[PDB]
Amino acid sequence: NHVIFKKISRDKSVTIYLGKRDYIDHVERVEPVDGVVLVDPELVKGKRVYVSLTCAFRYGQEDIDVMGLSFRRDLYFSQVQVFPPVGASGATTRLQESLIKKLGANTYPFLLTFPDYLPCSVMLQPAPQDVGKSCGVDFEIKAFATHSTDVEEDKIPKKSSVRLLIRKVQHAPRDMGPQPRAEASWQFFMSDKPLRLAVSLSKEIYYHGEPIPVTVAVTNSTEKTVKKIKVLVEQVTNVVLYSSDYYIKTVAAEEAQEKVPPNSSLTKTLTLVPLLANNRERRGIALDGKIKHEDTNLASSTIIKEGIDKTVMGILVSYQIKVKLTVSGLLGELTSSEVATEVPFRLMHPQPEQDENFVFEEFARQNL
Amino acid sequence: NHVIFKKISRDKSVTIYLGKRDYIDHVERVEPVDGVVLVDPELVKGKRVYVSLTCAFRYGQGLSFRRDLYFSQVQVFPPVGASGATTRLQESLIKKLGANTYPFLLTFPDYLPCSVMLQPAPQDVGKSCGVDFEIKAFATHSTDVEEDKIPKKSSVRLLIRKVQHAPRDMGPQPRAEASWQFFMSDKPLRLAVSLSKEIYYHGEPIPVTVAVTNSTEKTVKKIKVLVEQVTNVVLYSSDYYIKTVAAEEAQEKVPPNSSLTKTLTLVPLLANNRERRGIALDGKIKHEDTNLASSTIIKEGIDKTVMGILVSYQIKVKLTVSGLLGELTSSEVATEVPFRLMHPQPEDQDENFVFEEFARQNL
Amino acid sequence: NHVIFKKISRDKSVTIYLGKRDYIDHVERVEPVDGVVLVDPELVKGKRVYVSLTCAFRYGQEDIDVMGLSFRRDLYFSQVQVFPPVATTRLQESLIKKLGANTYPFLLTFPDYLPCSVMLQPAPQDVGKSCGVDFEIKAFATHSTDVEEDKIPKKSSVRLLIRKVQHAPRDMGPQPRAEASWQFFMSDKPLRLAVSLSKEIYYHGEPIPVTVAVTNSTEKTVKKIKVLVEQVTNVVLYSSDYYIKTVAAEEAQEKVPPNSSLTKTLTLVPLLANNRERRGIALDGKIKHEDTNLASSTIIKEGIDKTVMGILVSYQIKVKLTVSGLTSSEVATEVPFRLMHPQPEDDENFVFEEFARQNLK
Amino acid sequence: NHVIFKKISRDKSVTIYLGKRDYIDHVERVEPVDGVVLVDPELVKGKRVYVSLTCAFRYGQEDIDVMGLSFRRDLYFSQVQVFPPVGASGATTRLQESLIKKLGANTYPFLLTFPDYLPCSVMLQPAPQDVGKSCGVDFEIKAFATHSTDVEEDKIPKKSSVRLLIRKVQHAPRDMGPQPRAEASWQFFMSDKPLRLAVSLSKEIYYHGEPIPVTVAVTNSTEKTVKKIKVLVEQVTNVVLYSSDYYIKTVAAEEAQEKVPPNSSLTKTLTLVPLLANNRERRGIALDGKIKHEDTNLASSTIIKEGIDKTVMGILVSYQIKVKLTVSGLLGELTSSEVATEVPFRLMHPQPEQDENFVFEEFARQNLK
Numbered sequence A: 001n002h003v004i005f006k007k008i009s010r011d012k013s014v015t016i017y018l019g020k021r022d023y024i025d026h027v028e029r030v031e032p033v034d035g036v037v038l039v040d041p042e043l044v045k046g047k048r049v050y051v052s053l054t055c056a057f058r059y060g061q062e063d064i065d066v067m068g069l070s071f072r073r074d075l076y077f078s079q080v081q082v083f084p085p086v087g088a089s090g091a092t093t094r095l096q097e098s099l100i101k102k103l104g105a106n107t108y109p110f111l112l113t114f115p116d117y118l119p120c121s122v123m124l125q126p127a128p129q130d131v132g133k134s135c136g137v138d139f140e141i142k143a144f145a146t147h148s149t150d151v152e153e154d155k156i157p158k159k160s161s162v163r164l165l166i167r168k169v170q171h172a173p174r175d176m177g178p179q180p181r182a183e184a185s186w187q188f189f190m191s192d193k194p195l196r197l198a199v200s201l202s203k204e205i206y207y208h209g210e211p212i213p214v215t216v217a218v219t220n221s222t223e224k225t226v227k228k229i230k231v232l233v234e235q236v237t238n239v240v241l242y243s244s245d246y247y248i249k250t251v252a253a254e255e256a257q258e259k260v261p262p263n264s265s266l267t268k269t270l271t272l273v274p275l276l277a278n279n280r281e282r283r284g285i286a287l288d289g290k291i292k293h294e295d296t297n298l299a300s301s302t303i304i305k306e307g308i309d310k311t312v313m314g315i316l317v318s319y320q321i322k323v324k325l326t327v328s329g330l331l332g333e334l335t336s337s338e339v340a341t342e343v344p345f346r347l348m349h350p351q352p353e354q355d356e357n358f359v360f361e362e363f364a365r366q367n368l
Numbered sequence B: 001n002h003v004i005f006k007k008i009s010r011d012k013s014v015t016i017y018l019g020k021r022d023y024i025d026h027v028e029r030v031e032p033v034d035g036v037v038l039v040d041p042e043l044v045k046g047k048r049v050y051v052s053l054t055c056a057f058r059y060g061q062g063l064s065f066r067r068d069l070y071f072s073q074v075q076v077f078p079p080v081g082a083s084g085a086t087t088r089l090q091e092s093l094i095k096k097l098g099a100n101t102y103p104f105l106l107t108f109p110d111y112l113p114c115s116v117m118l119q120p121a122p123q124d125v126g127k128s129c130g131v132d133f134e135i136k137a138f139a140t141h142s143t144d145v146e147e148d149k150i151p152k153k154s155s156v157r158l159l160i161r162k163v164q165h166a167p168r169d170m171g172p173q174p175r176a177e178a179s180w181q182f183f184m185s186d187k188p189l190r191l192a193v194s195l196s197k198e199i200y201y202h203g204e205p206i207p208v209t210v211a212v213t214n215s216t217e218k219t220v221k222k223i224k225v226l227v228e229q230v231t232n233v234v235l236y237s238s239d240y241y242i243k244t245v246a247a248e249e250a251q252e253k254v255p256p257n258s259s260l261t262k263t264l265t266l267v268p269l270l271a272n273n274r275e276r277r278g279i280a281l282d283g284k285i286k287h288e289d290t291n292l293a294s295s296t297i298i299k300e301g302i303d304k305t306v307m308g309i310l311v312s313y314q315i316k317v318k319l320t321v322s323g324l325l326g327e328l329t330s331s332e333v334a335t336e337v338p339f340r341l342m343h344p345q346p347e348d349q350d351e352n353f354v355f356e357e358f359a360r361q362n363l
Numbered sequence C: 001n002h003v004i005f006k007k008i009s010r011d012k013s014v015t016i017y018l019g020k021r022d023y024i025d026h027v028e029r030v031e032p033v034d035g036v037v038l039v040d041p042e043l044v045k046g047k048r049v050y051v052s053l054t055c056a057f058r059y060g061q062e063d064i065d066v067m068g069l070s071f072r073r074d075l076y077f078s079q080v081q082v083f084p085p086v087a088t089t090r091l092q093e094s095l096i097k098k099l100g101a102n103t104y105p106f107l108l109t110f111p112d113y114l115p116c117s118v119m120l121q122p123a124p125q126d127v128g129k130s131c132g133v134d135f136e137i138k139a140f141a142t143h144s145t146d147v148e149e150d151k152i153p154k155k156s157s158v159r160l161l162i163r164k165v166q167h168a169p170r171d172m173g174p175q176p177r178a179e180a181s182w183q184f185f186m187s188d189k190p191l192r193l194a195v196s197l198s199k200e201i202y203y204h205g206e207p208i209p210v211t212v213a214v215t216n217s218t219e220k221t222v223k224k225i226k227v228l229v230e231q232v233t234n235v236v237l238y239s240s241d242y243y244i245k246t247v248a249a250e251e252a253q254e255k256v257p258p259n260s261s262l263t264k265t266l267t268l269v270p271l272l273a274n275n276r277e278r279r280g281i282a283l284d285g286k287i288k289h290e291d292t293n294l295a296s297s298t299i300i301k302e303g304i305d306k307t308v309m310g311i312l313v314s315y316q317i318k319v320k321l322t323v324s325g326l327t328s329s330e331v332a333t334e335v336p337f338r339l340m341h342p343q344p345e346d347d348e349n350f351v352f353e354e355f356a357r358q359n360l361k
Numbered sequence D: 001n002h003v004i005f006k007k008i009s010r011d012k013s014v015t016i017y018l019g020k021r022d023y024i025d026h027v028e029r030v031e032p033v034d035g036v037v038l039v040d041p042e043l044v045k046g047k048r049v050y051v052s053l054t055c056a057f058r059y060g061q062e063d064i065d066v067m068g069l070s071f072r073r074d075l076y077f078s079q080v081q082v083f084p085p086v087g088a089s090g091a092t093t094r095l096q097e098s099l100i101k102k103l104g105a106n107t108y109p110f111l112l113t114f115p116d117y118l119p120c121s122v123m124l125q126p127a128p129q130d131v132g133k134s135c136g137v138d139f140e141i142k143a144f145a146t147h148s149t150d151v152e153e154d155k156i157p158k159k160s161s162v163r164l165l166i167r168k169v170q171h172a173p174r175d176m177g178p179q180p181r182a183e184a185s186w187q188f189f190m191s192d193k194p195l196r197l198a199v200s201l202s203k204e205i206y207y208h209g210e211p212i213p214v215t216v217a218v219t220n221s222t223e224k225t226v227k228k229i230k231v232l233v234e235q236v237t238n239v240v241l242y243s244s245d246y247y248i249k250t251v252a253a254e255e256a257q258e259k260v261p262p263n264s265s266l267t268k269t270l271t272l273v274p275l276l277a278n279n280r281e282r283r284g285i286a287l288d289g290k291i292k293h294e295d296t297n298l299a300s301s302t303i304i305k306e307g308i309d310k311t312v313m314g315i316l317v318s319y320q321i322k323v324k325l326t327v328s329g330l331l332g333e334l335t336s337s338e339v340a341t342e343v344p345f346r347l348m349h350p351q352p353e354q355d356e357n358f359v360f361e362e363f364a365r366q367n368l369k
């Protein structure tokens, strides 16, 4: 029934159990991390075991014959004690009670909460053409044992520790108002005659995998012909911590072969689905995980909370529909000119919503 | 059918024959001046005949300022050494003209400018100036022990041109990006300009690609693209000229929160300019074969001042923006992209000769 | 004997007269620009003449075989009409009398949220391009149709690049010494470094007495004491460029042996004159000009985003101690201070001059 | 005075002589194995004598009795005939000509060459804490006699064979990599201020026994104190054939006595010498020979040649400088992690360069305790 994710320390003294790999941010609040640590009471005798939740922005990558540039900023750190027991985590959950019963009396609960001022899982490995380096926001759940002298020696032995890279996934809020169409229009005067472009989306928020119906209305009062209409989903990424890196990548494209001749108008609805699967080249785009992993998608739209400096988000991700019109010259070779406009939208995961049966699995994510 | 250019001295004692009026500079090397002098053996008896190549910068309309940039002289009569032609053109001319025909070869060095001159307009401060190239054949004689003489009547001068042709190399594809944030606006106006290549030829069309990204709440009302010629006199007087030698005004406007990409084609030509004063030419205004001056090409470790007149070309793109002019700026929204303008690359038996007067055809 | 600065348009239709090249910012308020425009009434018939004050940040430079990157942000724009004619000053009344009835006054004021004249031409070693904050006074004539065609003809316009110079405020409290101390534990024994300046604000050309107190309780020797004035420049608009340059240095030959203490006062004078290489340093004008100095300390006003200053300039005293081993180690510390021009001052005869600033070599 | 290494077969019929125990790999090419076999012509009558060079990766214990206790992958095998003599039979090298003269007319030369795609002598005996078993790359020079029986079965007796475990030792090329450098910075939770660490080595290649000057620049703009600066030489071992075993061990450590207080910077050069002698515990570390032997050192850096699959190297060995900063009021307050950076470098042996007089010795390597 309920799949539980487990990882064990090298020295087999500390084992951590989580209900999920991915924890839901739905704007209003964030799903807290409720898990249990199974200690070997022999191997933790006279020792203290803690669990920490760390959110960190990182920037840099390994390059041969290049100077190693690394940068880390911790955006959140919290730590509770699981052993010896003290009820650090306060009130308990059903998942914990059920796991304690199944695992035995050496099982201790932890609850680490997320605040409201953190970004969601975003990371980016650049392409050859791209100027800056690998960067991302990681979320680490680390259970580790300290000795009674190790607090004075500032030592946390590696073999007694276990770390899990969880994801903070952006879901839509549960109460949302009815959604107005995302629609703009432009009037491109050419020889004092207008070329009018109206672009309309069904709504403002789309879900990963959901088709985006882009309605394009070209009214051509000019003496020129609209030769081509290209519609893109562009992902715009702004690294806002160590280096002001900028990425703009097409994650979906449809190119109609419609012409709009002089003194005529054309309305057309193209459907685009921005998906990581569409992109052979998975570098230079904001993902919510590593390229190698299967459960990795396009990064959701950053949602900056009121009175929160955007820089503490580390990487800003936004999506837009771009419409390019190729317009004929009167007589030339590249006299053909292009006009383009953008319509912003947000992309995220859908809204969120006994005695359990537990199947235990290694936390490690499946590859491709 | 090879056209040969001839000029004859007043006293008919010395006649000079050149293959060309215009000699090719293609950066790597410069085409030397290979010609022949036909003497009247009666009228040069006991006389010596020389041919000189002089490059001089002049400034003024009496005679105001001269700087000699190069001088070389050879002897044609009496004959020097083997006296056999060094080129096919000479061998062929000697055969056609007879045994009173003597070859000369005057070479150009690599540190000289090309034919540039400038006659100013009423609006312009500063005077006429230019770099001239003179081929002069003249006879010397002595009636005294105490002095040799050089009569004007025994001399013949030709004003040849050193014409700039393209090298094998081209510079990287020229590109500019400019952006403006006007007073009280959080939003940029981005202008990107691109040319197909770095070197264009006289008469060749220049495709200027302009990318206006307008994130402002203002409208780009006009996009004007110019070829500007920039002239810097660098010897007697620090005179500066900047003139439009081509202009195209796109019909498209760029409304708020939109972007426009557009390719305008310009051809910088002397023919476009009714007013031919205040611009760097490669010859006199009156002459038909006169064009816009080619881009100066300063060689490494050569002081730019020995070029006399520096000529450069650039594409200027001016954006006219609504509701700033007089309101959020007293200035102009523009960027420049440099390029070089010159003549095409060079192309790398017994001839039939038609002889013509060297004098260039007028308008 | 008041020296007046004049410049005339190409078409000789508009001539502008200013009292100063340099206008004083003393934190509390900024000295406004009071001048006059002399029109040729024949050449401005049916035309309107305006004067604008523009403050702009610029970034970029011309480079052969390199992509031309240019960037401008206007930080302030204001415009008044001088012709046809629409409180005055003594300088204006006096200039009108001397020049005639075709002379019209203008007053353009500065707000409190602008930086002062700062610019920077980089060195070979430096990444990043030329940038600066310029102040333009431009007098120009428009035609009666030119307001509808959005056109300002160049030949009818005249521009002056004035400076906004940072002076200290006129009422200032008594100044606490700028002092910090550090304890560098070495084998659990402290090496204590105290650095102290006489005051917090120094003037360009004023000597800075740096008092350095080394207390060495370690078993190591302080072999060398170097004291620097470092200029720190942060470009904060187009590109996050960073410069740190020594504009003054004194290297004592003092040793502080184990279990001893040494107090020493070095005097440094941060000056552009000390620097042969004048590139990679924040100046208040062009390198070529004579009246150009080191840029004054940026003074960010409360609740003003530092980014609208364009270039941030700060000064600090750096103390480097070379400490022996048994290879040697270097410890260093910084003490911030502010550098600016002194406090301002609690029928005329006019000599007219071209606005163009005097050069060096 | 050239020391020659000799081993003799149990039956005294075949004796092998080598100039060296250790043969030089300097990237560009590898020093070939030039030796001679002395046969007893009575005891090899109607017999053929060969010499083989085998490079093999092994994992587990050495095969006992009949049981296969080892995983074996052969990376190179070559064999030549010494007896009866092949062709001209004259020496190809000065060492051979000289040995033939000194030993007599029953002395026959052999030359076995190394290719460019092999690893160098690497082996590893694990510690109690370590998962995974003993493994290594061995180089065997084996001289052995074959004879034919009355049924058409040829025989290779153990008693007629002699095997020598030579080493392929990594010496430096002509090229060196660029001066290695790292920069790291941290902004801790609730701190607006960076802690900057810059690390620099003098060069990219160091020799065994050569001191490594590690220059560390700590710029501390934080309100916290750097309480400790520890600098390590870490050896990283990756077994890449039978089992994906990973080892990372400190082979040298220096702890600076300086602390870096708030709003200060410290530049400091610590000298480390990564040596097997520093390590009492010699298990869990990549060596170039057996622990018991005296001439055994730390394994040199693996040098993977272009377009050669790294798996045919068997064991990958790399070295790095690690700098750990211990920062006040962090551990269990603003981090459950470590403040550290790594700078890679390569560790190997130095660059290479009448009748001579021979002293003969047993090939067996000298032990310790």
Ligand SMILES: O=P(O)(O)O[C@H]1[C@@H](OP(=O)(O)O)[C@H](OP(=O)(O)O)[C@@H](OP(=O)(O)OP(=O)(O)O)[C@H](OP(=O)(O)O)[C@H]1OP(=O)(O)O
Binding pocket: A155, A156, A157, A158, A159, D129, D232, D250, D253, D281
């Ligand atoms: O800092 P390092 O590189 O020296 O290593 C850590 C620790 O590694 P870790 O941090 O990954 O857990 C070592 O264990 P391992 O890497 O072999 O597992 C431990 O060695 P140990 O107990 O003798 O173990 P064995 O001899 O039985 O192998 C060492 O102790 P010291 O050097 O003697 O103080 C520790 O140093 P510190 O920071 O002072 O606590």
Ligand SMILES: O=P(O)(O)O[C@H]1[C@@H](OP(=O)(O)O)[C@H](OP(=O)(O)O)[C@@H](OP(=O)(O)OP(=O)(O)O)[C@H](OP(=O)(O)O)[C@H]1OP(=O)(O)O
Binding pocket: A163, A165, A363, A364, A365
């Ligand atoms: O360094 P890391 O975080 O990037 O990941 C490394 C490795 O770290 P180390 O070898 O530098 O010590 C991880 O080991 P521990 O952190 O558990 O100690 C290991 O497990 P993991 O973190 O659970 O798995 P992930 O979801 O992170 O992939 C991971 O597994 P593999 O994907 O199957 O190879 C490796 O991936 P890679 O780097 O792509 O080779």
Ligand SMILES: O=P(O)(O)O[C@H]1[C@@H](OP(=O)(O)O)[C@H](OP(=O)(O)O)[C@@H](OP(=O)(O)OP(=O)(O)O)[C@H](OP(=O)(O)O)[C@H]1OP(=O)(O)O
Binding pocket: B157, B159, B358, B359, B360
């Ligand atoms: O001073 P210059 O160089 O400008 O030339 C003068 C004149 O110079 P002089 O004063 O020494 O006599 C030339 O006579 P010569 O001394 O060379 O024999 C003459 O012939 P040219 O050189 O073949 O012809 P171009 O190609 O130079 O025009 C030229 O053309 P004509 O008008 O058709 O007579 C004149 O032009 P200008 O006065 O501008 O009209």
Ligand SMILES: O=P(O)(O)O[C@H]1[C@@H](OP(=O)(O)O)[C@H](OP(=O)(O)O)[C@@H](OP(=O)(O)OP(=O)(O)O)[C@H](OP(=O)(O)O)[C@H]1OP(=O)(O)O
Binding pocket: B226, B244, B247, C146, C151, C152, C153, C154, C155
């Ligand atoms: O294209 P260019 O660069 O050669 O410009 C010409 C002129 O074009 P033209 O040669 O086709 O007639 C421009 O007018 P348009 O192209 O808009 O018609 C005019 O600009 P403007 O102020 O907006 O307009 P006006 O009110 O003065 O007409 C410009 O004046 P400046 O740059 O201010 O000095 C002129 O310069 P110059 O040659 O010195 O007199």
Ligand SMILES: O=P(O)(O)O[C@H]1[C@@H](OP(=O)(O)O)[C@H](OP(=O)(O)O)[C@@H](OP(=O)(O)OP(=O)(O)O)[C@H](OP(=O)(O)O)[C@H]1OP(=O)(O)O
Binding pocket: C159, C286, C356, C357, C358
């Ligand atoms: O944009 P700029 O500040 O670089 O100025 C340009 C030029 O402006 P334009 O070409 O845009 O019209 C100025 O001309 P006008 O103001 O008289 O119209 C000129 O004099 P200037 O600034 O008054 O003189 P000073 O203050 O320096 O004495 C200045 O000469 P330089 O003395 O060598 O600097 C030029 O500099 P450049 O080309 O870099 O050498």
